[PDB]
Amino acid sequence: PLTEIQVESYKKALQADVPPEKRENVGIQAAFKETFPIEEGDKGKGGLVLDFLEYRIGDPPFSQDECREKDLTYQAPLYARLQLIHKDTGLIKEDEVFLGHLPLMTEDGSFIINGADRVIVSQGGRTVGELMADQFRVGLARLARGVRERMVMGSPDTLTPAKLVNSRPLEAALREFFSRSQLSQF
Amino acid sequence: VGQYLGLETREVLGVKRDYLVLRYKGEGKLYLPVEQLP
């Protein structure tokens, strides 16, 4: 079939119930591990290194049934464990940072968005799982950029992972991917 | 208000360093190296 190929695909792109160190270099994981670390040396001593440790996918607050009746979106929240290294001092600053809500894929390919049963057709040759992961990379690449900028024009001492990170660019990129998803006819 | 959450042997910048691990109430988990004075 396709749904079964497609479902698993997305399901491996998120690795959502896989313990962080049993996680393969795929989809988001790659996206994150590849796009991070963001360093600004540039000041002779230090500036900062911001490294990625892990990501957490929340578990769904509403079930598919609840979601289709109560007209809600079927999505888990995404968090990233970020860490700011002052090499000027050695000081480290950890933080779980909120990166937005990921839609979960129900058993038949469809997503549930605000009660509605919506599908991302692959037209094709790059499955739904890698289609998302690809667009995820772009967002992150933009988010990776708000940080590089703030580091340059903030006081390192008052900077912290949560302040450097702006999720908007990541979300804008997701909204657009899941925005042009279509309604299902089963 | 800083809460002292003990010492910890973390490896960063490619290798070990111990830090004094503090959670400032308000939230950050601050890791402060033993090599420094304060």
PDB file of C-alpha atoms in Angstrom:
ATOM      1  CA  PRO A   1       0.000   0.000   0.000  1.00  0.00           C
ATOM      2  CA  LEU A   2       0.895   3.702   0.359  1.00  0.00           C
ATOM      3  CA  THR A   3      -0.662   4.845   3.654  1.00  0.00           C
ATOM      4  CA  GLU A   4       1.353   2.157   5.450  1.00  0.00           C
ATOM      5  CA  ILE A   5       4.604   3.155   3.670  1.00  0.00           C
ATOM      6  CA  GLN A   6       3.781   6.851   4.203  1.00  0.00           C
ATOM      7  CA  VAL A   7       2.717   6.538   7.850  1.00  0.00           C
ATOM      8  CA  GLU A   8       5.859   4.713   8.941  1.00  0.00           C
ATOM      9  CA  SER A   9       7.936   7.194   6.893  1.00  0.00           C
ATOM     10  CA  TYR A  10       6.655  10.264   8.816  1.00  0.00           C
ATOM     11  CA  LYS A  11       6.845   8.135  11.972  1.00  0.00           C
ATOM     12  CA  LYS A  12      10.608   7.592  11.375  1.00  0.00           C
ATOM     13  CA  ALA A  13      11.143  11.256  10.501  1.00  0.00           C
ATOM     14  CA  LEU A  14      10.038  12.206  14.029  1.00  0.00           C
ATOM     15  CA  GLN A  15      11.387   9.184  15.971  1.00  0.00           C
ATOM     16  CA  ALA A  16       8.882  10.559  18.492  1.00  0.00           C
ATOM     17  CA  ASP A  17       8.786   7.663  21.017  1.00  0.00           C
ATOM     18  CA  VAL A  18      12.467   6.659  20.529  1.00  0.00           C
ATOM     19  CA  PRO A  19      14.903   7.328  23.388  1.00  0.00           C
ATOM     20  CA  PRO A  20      17.251  10.224  22.331  1.00  0.00           C
ATOM     21  CA  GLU A  21      20.448   8.095  22.093  1.00  0.00           C
ATOM     22  CA  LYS A  22      18.719   5.192  20.286  1.00  0.00           C
ATOM     23  CA  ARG A  23      17.865   7.764  17.589  1.00  0.00           C
ATOM     24  CA  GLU A  24      19.095   7.424  14.012  1.00  0.00           C
ATOM     25  CA  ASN A  25      20.418  10.304  11.886  1.00  0.00           C
ATOM     26  CA  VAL A  26      17.201  10.952  10.050  1.00  0.00           C
ATOM     27  CA  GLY A  27      14.578  13.605   9.499  1.00  0.00           C
ATOM     28  CA  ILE A  28      14.589  16.116  12.319  1.00  0.00           C
ATOM     29  CA  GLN A  29      17.433  14.444  14.158  1.00  0.00           C
ATOM     30  CA  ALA A  30      19.755  14.975  11.229  1.00  0.00           C
ATOM     31  CA  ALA A  31      18.203  18.419  10.674  1.00  0.00           C
ATOM     32  CA  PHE A  32      19.113  19.347  14.286  1.00  0.00           C
ATOM     33  CA  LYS A  33      22.445  17.569  14.627  1.00  0.00           C
ATOM     34  CA  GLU A  34      23.629  18.918  11.254  1.00  0.00           C
ATOM     35  CA  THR A  35      22.479  22.551  11.681  1.00  0.00           C
ATOM     36  CA  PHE A  36      23.926  22.843  15.228  1.00  0.00           C
ATOM     37  CA  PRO A  37      26.372  24.162  16.677  1.00  0.00           C
ATOM     38  CA  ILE A  38      26.167  27.927  16.061  1.00  0.00           C
ATOM     39  CA  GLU A  39      29.404  29.629  17.021  1.00  0.00           C
ATOM     40  CA  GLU A  40      30.465  33.137  17.021  1.00  0.00           C
ATOM     41  CA  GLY A  41      34.087  33.135  17.896  1.00  0.00           C
ATOM     42  CA  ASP A  42      34.351  36.303  16.424  1.00  0.00           C
ATOM     43  CA  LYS A  43      35.318  38.248  19.512  1.00  0.00           C
ATOM     44  CA  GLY A  44      38.884  37.181  20.064  1.00  0.00           C
ATOM     45  CA  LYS A  45      38.079  35.388  23.255  1.00  0.00           C
ATOM     46  CA  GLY A  46      34.869  33.430  23.280  1.00  0.00           C
ATOM     47  CA  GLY A  47      31.670  34.692  21.911  1.00  0.00           C
ATOM     48  CA  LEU A  48      29.426  31.668  22.292  1.00  0.00           C
ATOM     49  CA  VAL A  49      28.911  28.093  21.170  1.00  0.00           C
ATOM     50  CA  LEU A  50      25.280  26.928  21.199  1.00  0.00           C
ATOM     51  CA  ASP A  51      25.073  23.118  20.895  1.00  0.00           C
ATOM     52  CA  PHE A  52      22.207  20.665  20.459  1.00  0.00           C
ATOM     53  CA  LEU A  53      21.791  17.839  22.967  1.00  0.00           C
ATOM     54  CA  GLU A  54      18.385  16.298  22.291  1.00  0.00           C
ATOM     55  CA  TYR A  55      14.816  17.011  21.229  1.00  0.00           C
ATOM     56  CA  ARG A  56      11.603  16.035  23.029  1.00  0.00           C
ATOM     57  CA  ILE A  57       8.327  15.416  21.251  1.00  0.00           C
ATOM     58  CA  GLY A  58       5.443  15.810  23.620  1.00  0.00           C
ATOM     59  CA  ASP A  59       2.694  13.221  23.516  1.00  0.00           C
ATOM     60  CA  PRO A  60      -0.758  14.086  22.132  1.00  0.00           C
ATOM     61  CA  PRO A  61      -3.159  15.894  24.538  1.00  0.00           C
ATOM     62  CA  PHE A  62      -6.185  14.839  22.482  1.00  0.00           C
ATOM     63  CA  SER A  63      -6.801  11.545  20.722  1.00  0.00           C
ATOM     64  CA  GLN A  64      -7.876  11.335  17.067  1.00  0.00           C
ATOM     65  CA  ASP A  65     -11.444  10.621  18.189  1.00  0.00           C
ATOM     66  CA  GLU A  66     -11.456  13.602  20.549  1.00  0.00           C
ATOM     67  CA  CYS A  67      -9.861  15.667  17.757  1.00  0.00           C
ATOM     68  CA  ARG A  68     -12.507  14.855  15.108  1.00  0.00           C
ATOM     69  CA  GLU A  69     -15.408  15.434  17.511  1.00  0.00           C
ATOM     70  CA  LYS A  70     -14.116  18.392  19.491  1.00  0.00           C
ATOM     71  CA  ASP A  71     -12.738  19.948  16.275  1.00  0.00           C
ATOM     72  CA  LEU A  72      -9.127  20.195  17.391  1.00  0.00           C
ATOM     73  CA  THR A  73      -5.695  19.686  15.831  1.00  0.00           C
ATOM     74  CA  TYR A  74      -3.851  16.386  16.417  1.00  0.00           C
ATOM     75  CA  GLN A  75      -0.362  17.611  17.342  1.00  0.00           C
ATOM     76  CA  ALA A  76       2.466  17.035  19.841  1.00  0.00           C
ATOM     77  CA  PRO A  77       4.687  19.906  21.091  1.00  0.00           C
ATOM     78  CA  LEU A  78       8.369  20.029  20.158  1.00  0.00           C
ATOM     79  CA  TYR A  79      11.110  21.033  22.624  1.00  0.00           C
ATOM     80  CA  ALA A  80      14.893  21.214  22.189  1.00  0.00           C
ATOM     81  CA  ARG A  81      17.518  20.925  24.955  1.00  0.00           C
ATOM     82  CA  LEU A  82      19.893  23.778  24.124  1.00  0.00           C
ATOM     83  CA  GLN A  83      23.094  24.791  25.836  1.00  0.00           C
ATOM     84  CA  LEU A  84      25.132  28.027  25.759  1.00  0.00           C
ATOM     85  CA  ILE A  85      28.905  27.710  26.220  1.00  0.00           C
ATOM     86  CA  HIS A  86      30.914  30.745  27.243  1.00  0.00           C
ATOM     87  CA  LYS A  87      34.428  29.690  26.265  1.00  0.00           C
ATOM     88  CA  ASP A  88      35.576  33.081  27.621  1.00  0.00           C
ATOM     89  CA  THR A  89      34.699  31.634  31.063  1.00  0.00           C
ATOM     90  CA  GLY A  90      33.743  27.948  30.653  1.00  0.00           C
ATOM     91  CA  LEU A  91      30.236  28.760  31.898  1.00  0.00           C
ATOM     92  CA  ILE A  92      27.391  26.585  30.612  1.00  0.00           C
ATOM     93  CA  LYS A  93      23.684  27.363  30.474  1.00  0.00           C
ATOM     94  CA  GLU A  94      21.158  24.609  29.714  1.00  0.00           C
ATOM     95  CA  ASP A  95      17.559  25.145  28.661  1.00  0.00           C
ATOM     96  CA  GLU A  96      14.656  23.195  27.165  1.00  0.00           C
ATOM     97  CA  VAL A  97      13.393  25.598  24.467  1.00  0.00           C
ATOM     98  CA  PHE A  98       9.929  25.482  22.857  1.00  0.00           C
ATOM     99  CA  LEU A  99      10.037  25.073  19.053  1.00  0.00           C
ATOM    100  CA  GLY A 100       6.284  24.716  18.348  1.00  0.00           C
ATOM    101  CA  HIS A 101       3.663  22.076  17.587  1.00  0.00           C
ATOM    102  CA  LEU A 102       4.204  19.170  15.189  1.00  0.00           C
ATOM    103  CA  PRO A 103       1.117  17.553  13.656  1.00  0.00           C
ATOM    104  CA  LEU A 104       0.960  13.794  14.252  1.00  0.00           C
ATOM    105  CA  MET A 105      -0.027  11.425  11.431  1.00  0.00           C
ATOM    106  CA  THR A 106      -3.024   9.197  12.077  1.00  0.00           C
ATOM    107  CA  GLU A 107      -3.197   5.555  10.962  1.00  0.00           C
ATOM    108  CA  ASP A 108      -4.287   6.292   7.350  1.00  0.00           C
ATOM    109  CA  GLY A 109      -1.968   9.129   6.247  1.00  0.00           C
ATOM    110  CA  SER A 110      -4.297  11.953   7.229  1.00  0.00           C
ATOM    111  CA  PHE A 111      -3.549  14.717   9.693  1.00  0.00           C
ATOM    112  CA  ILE A 112      -6.318  16.153  11.854  1.00  0.00           C
ATOM    113  CA  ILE A 113      -6.173  19.960  11.747  1.00  0.00           C
ATOM    114  CA  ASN A 114      -8.881  21.858  13.654  1.00  0.00           C
ATOM    115  CA  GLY A 115     -11.262  18.891  13.331  1.00  0.00           C
ATOM    116  CA  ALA A 116     -10.614  18.467   9.600  1.00  0.00           C
ATOM    117  CA  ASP A 117      -9.103  15.366   7.977  1.00  0.00           C
ATOM    118  CA  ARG A 118      -6.281  16.695   5.774  1.00  0.00           C
ATOM    119  CA  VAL A 119      -3.711  14.992   3.551  1.00  0.00           C
ATOM    120  CA  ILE A 120      -0.288  15.824   2.171  1.00  0.00           C
ATOM    121  CA  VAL A 121      -0.179  14.235  -1.260  1.00  0.00           C
ATOM    122  CA  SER A 122       3.257  13.169  -2.476  1.00  0.00           C
ATOM    123  CA  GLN A 123       3.306  13.858  -6.207  1.00  0.00           C
ATOM    124  CA  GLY A 124       5.825  12.267  -5.632  1.00  0.00           C
ATOM    125  CA  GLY A 125       9.176  10.606  -5.283  1.00  0.00           C
ATOM    126  CA  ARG A 126      10.010  12.075  -1.946  1.00  0.00           C
ATOM    127  CA  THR A 127       7.687  10.698   0.739  1.00  0.00           C
ATOM    128  CA  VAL A 128       5.678  12.807   3.221  1.00  0.00           C
ATOM    129  CA  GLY A 129       8.233  12.075   5.969  1.00  0.00           C
ATOM    130  CA  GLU A 130      11.212  13.500   4.061  1.00  0.00           C
ATOM    131  CA  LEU A 131       9.100  16.314   2.548  1.00  0.00           C
ATOM    132  CA  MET A 132       8.513  17.592   6.118  1.00  0.00           C
ATOM    133  CA  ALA A 133      12.081  16.933   7.296  1.00  0.00           C
ATOM    134  CA  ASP A 134      13.378  18.904   4.286  1.00  0.00           C
ATOM    135  CA  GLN A 135      11.199  21.878   5.123  1.00  0.00           C
ATOM    136  CA  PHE A 136      12.142  21.496   8.799  1.00  0.00           C
ATOM    137  CA  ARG A 137      15.808  21.971   7.816  1.00  0.00           C
ATOM    138  CA  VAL A 138      14.937  25.291   6.153  1.00  0.00           C
ATOM    139  CA  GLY A 139      13.115  26.639   9.204  1.00  0.00           C
ATOM    140  CA  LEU A 140      15.965  25.589  11.504  1.00  0.00           C
ATOM    141  CA  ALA A 141      18.480  27.159   9.085  1.00  0.00           C
ATOM    142  CA  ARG A 142      16.519  30.428   9.571  1.00  0.00           C
ATOM    143  CA  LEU A 143      16.247  29.960  13.328  1.00  0.00           C
ATOM    144  CA  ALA A 144      19.978  29.157  13.359  1.00  0.00           C
ATOM    145  CA  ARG A 145      20.214  32.700  12.027  1.00  0.00           C
ATOM    146  CA  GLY A 146      18.293  34.707  14.611  1.00  0.00           C
ATOM    147  CA  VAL A 147      20.771  33.296  17.114  1.00  0.00           C
ATOM    148  CA  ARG A 148      23.913  34.168  15.117  1.00  0.00           C
ATOM    149  CA  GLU A 149      22.545  37.718  14.845  1.00  0.00           C
ATOM    150  CA  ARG A 150      21.665  38.189  18.535  1.00  0.00           C
ATOM    151  CA  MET A 151      25.054  36.857  19.638  1.00  0.00           C
ATOM    152  CA  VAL A 152      26.638  39.638  17.558  1.00  0.00           C
ATOM    153  CA  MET A 153      24.554  42.496  18.973  1.00  0.00           C
ATOM    154  CA  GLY A 154      23.853  41.444  22.566  1.00  0.00           C
ATOM    155  CA  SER A 155      26.031  41.350  25.653  1.00  0.00           C
ATOM    156  CA  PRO A 156      27.266  37.709  25.848  1.00  0.00           C
ATOM    157  CA  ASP A 157      26.876  37.797  29.636  1.00  0.00           C
ATOM    158  CA  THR A 158      23.110  38.481  29.530  1.00  0.00           C
ATOM    159  CA  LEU A 159      22.571  36.012  26.643  1.00  0.00           C
ATOM    160  CA  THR A 160      21.029  32.569  27.195  1.00  0.00           C
ATOM    161  CA  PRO A 161      19.673  29.796  24.897  1.00  0.00           C
ATOM    162  CA  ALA A 162      16.023  30.948  25.269  1.00  0.00           C
ATOM    163  CA  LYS A 163      16.878  34.572  24.323  1.00  0.00           C
ATOM    164  CA  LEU A 164      18.910  33.637  21.234  1.00  0.00           C
ATOM    165  CA  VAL A 165      16.222  31.264  19.981  1.00  0.00           C
ATOM    166  CA  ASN A 166      13.205  32.571  18.105  1.00  0.00           C
ATOM    167  CA  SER A 167      10.918  29.809  16.866  1.00  0.00           C
ATOM    168  CA  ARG A 168       8.871  31.981  14.490  1.00  0.00           C
ATOM    169  CA  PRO A 169      10.978  31.144  11.408  1.00  0.00           C
ATOM    170  CA  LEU A 170      10.749  27.402  12.124  1.00  0.00           C
ATOM    171  CA  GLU A 171       6.993  27.656  12.586  1.00  0.00           C
ATOM    172  CA  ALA A 172       6.394  29.878   9.557  1.00  0.00           C
ATOM    173  CA  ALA A 173       8.170  27.146   7.569  1.00  0.00           C
ATOM    174  CA  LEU A 174       5.934  24.434   9.085  1.00  0.00           C
ATOM    175  CA  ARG A 175       2.686  26.402   8.830  1.00  0.00           C
ATOM    176  CA  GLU A 176       3.412  26.746   5.078  1.00  0.00           C
ATOM    177  CA  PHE A 177       4.070  22.977   4.669  1.00  0.00           C
ATOM    178  CA  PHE A 178       0.967  21.889   6.564  1.00  0.00           C
ATOM    179  CA  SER A 179      -0.899  25.034   5.424  1.00  0.00           C
ATOM    180  CA  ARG A 180      -1.312  23.808   1.850  1.00  0.00           C
ATOM    181  CA  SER A 181      -2.393  20.338   2.979  1.00  0.00           C
ATOM    182  CA  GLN A 182      -5.739  19.331   1.425  1.00  0.00           C
ATOM    183  CA  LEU A 183      -9.024  17.946   2.778  1.00  0.00           C
ATOM    184  CA  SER A 184      -9.655  14.190   2.509  1.00  0.00           C
ATOM    185  CA  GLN A 185     -12.316  12.230   0.645  1.00  0.00           C
ATOM    186  CA  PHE A 186     -12.192   8.693   2.050  1.00  0.00           C
TER     187      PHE A 186
ATOM    188  CA  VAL B   1      18.051  32.799  44.945  1.00  0.00           C
ATOM    189  CA  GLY B   2      20.449  30.181  43.591  1.00  0.00           C
ATOM    190  CA  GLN B   3      19.822  26.538  44.343  1.00  0.00           C
ATOM    191  CA  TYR B   4      22.937  24.368  44.559  1.00  0.00           C
ATOM    192  CA  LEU B   5      22.399  21.093  42.681  1.00  0.00           C
ATOM    193  CA  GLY B   6      25.874  19.663  43.313  1.00  0.00           C
ATOM    194  CA  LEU B   7      29.040  19.061  41.330  1.00  0.00           C
ATOM    195  CA  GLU B   8      28.997  17.216  38.001  1.00  0.00           C
ATOM    196  CA  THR B   9      31.661  15.970  35.559  1.00  0.00           C
ATOM    197  CA  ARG B  10      30.445  17.198  32.162  1.00  0.00           C
ATOM    198  CA  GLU B  11      32.500  17.016  28.974  1.00  0.00           C
ATOM    199  CA  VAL B  12      32.291  20.159  26.815  1.00  0.00           C
ATOM    200  CA  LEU B  13      34.290  21.726  23.935  1.00  0.00           C
ATOM    201  CA  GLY B  14      35.562  18.195  23.173  1.00  0.00           C
ATOM    202  CA  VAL B  15      36.348  16.923  26.716  1.00  0.00           C
ATOM    203  CA  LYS B  16      35.709  16.815  30.500  1.00  0.00           C
ATOM    204  CA  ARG B  17      35.240  19.653  32.886  1.00  0.00           C
ATOM    205  CA  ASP B  18      33.645  19.616  36.326  1.00  0.00           C
ATOM    206  CA  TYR B  19      31.178  22.395  37.133  1.00  0.00           C
ATOM    207  CA  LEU B  20      29.364  23.579  40.216  1.00  0.00           C
ATOM    208  CA  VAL B  21      25.780  22.880  39.101  1.00  0.00           C
ATOM    209  CA  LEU B  22      23.278  25.532  40.186  1.00  0.00           C
ATOM    210  CA  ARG B  23      19.638  26.029  39.302  1.00  0.00           C
ATOM    211  CA  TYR B  24      18.782  29.679  39.821  1.00  0.00           C
ATOM    212  CA  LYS B  25      15.168  29.767  40.954  1.00  0.00           C
ATOM    213  CA  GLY B  26      13.668  31.643  38.138  1.00  0.00           C
ATOM    214  CA  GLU B  27      14.843  29.337  35.517  1.00  0.00           C
ATOM    215  CA  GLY B  28      18.206  28.553  34.094  1.00  0.00           C
ATOM    216  CA  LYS B  29      20.380  25.563  34.816  1.00  0.00           C
ATOM    217  CA  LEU B  30      23.725  27.313  35.230  1.00  0.00           C
ATOM    218  CA  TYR B  31      26.952  25.237  35.062  1.00  0.00           C
ATOM    219  CA  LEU B  32      29.864  27.039  36.695  1.00  0.00           C
ATOM    220  CA  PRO B  33      33.413  25.662  36.209  1.00  0.00           C
ATOM    221  CA  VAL B  34      35.625  24.764  39.197  1.00  0.00           C
ATOM    222  CA  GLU B  35      38.641  26.211  37.324  1.00  0.00           C
ATOM    223  CA  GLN B  36      37.260  29.759  37.782  1.00  0.00           C
ATOM    224  CA  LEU B  37      37.353  31.494  41.194  1.00  0.00           C
ATOM    225  CA  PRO B  38      33.662  32.485  41.532  1.00  0.00           C
TER     226      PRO B  38
END
